[PDB]
Amino acid sequence: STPHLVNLNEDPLMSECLLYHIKDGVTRVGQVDMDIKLTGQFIREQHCLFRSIPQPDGEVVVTLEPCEGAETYVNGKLVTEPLVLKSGNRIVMGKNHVFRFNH
Ligand SMILES: [Cl-]
Ligand code: NI
Numbered sequence: 716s717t718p719h720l721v722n723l724n725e726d727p728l729m730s731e732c733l734l735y736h737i738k739d740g741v742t743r744v745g746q747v748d749m750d751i752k753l754t755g756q757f758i759r760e761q762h763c764l765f766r767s768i769p770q771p772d773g774e775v776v777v778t779l780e781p782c783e784g785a786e787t788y789v790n791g792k793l794v795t796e797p798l799v800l801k802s803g804n805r806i807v808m809g810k811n812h813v814f815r816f817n818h
Contacts, residue, residue, distance in 0.1 A: 717737065718737040718767065720816060721814055722813070722814055723815055724813055730754070731754075739767050744765070745758060745762040745782075747761070748760075749761070749762075762809070763785055763787050766778045778799050780798075781797075786809060787806065789804050789805070801816070804816040
């Protein structure tokens, strides 16, 4: 299937987005001029980005790259360099945005 980024927040705001499909290419996450806009106090203008790249068989590989000074955690570990995501991974951006990556 397409990879999904699913919003795990228990009380998401009306403006807040519950589910994104991660499309082929770069999805930029942040506040100012991004493909996914998150508003929390700790979300930087350019927070991080997803890369979706195809394999020989069509199956996709999604990586997450954090931006300088923008905190993101995958399964509890702060991610500081780019990282290949896996279905089930829990991603927190800033302190107020929790997702699951579902492939
Ligand atoms: Cl935040
Ligand atoms: Ni879907």
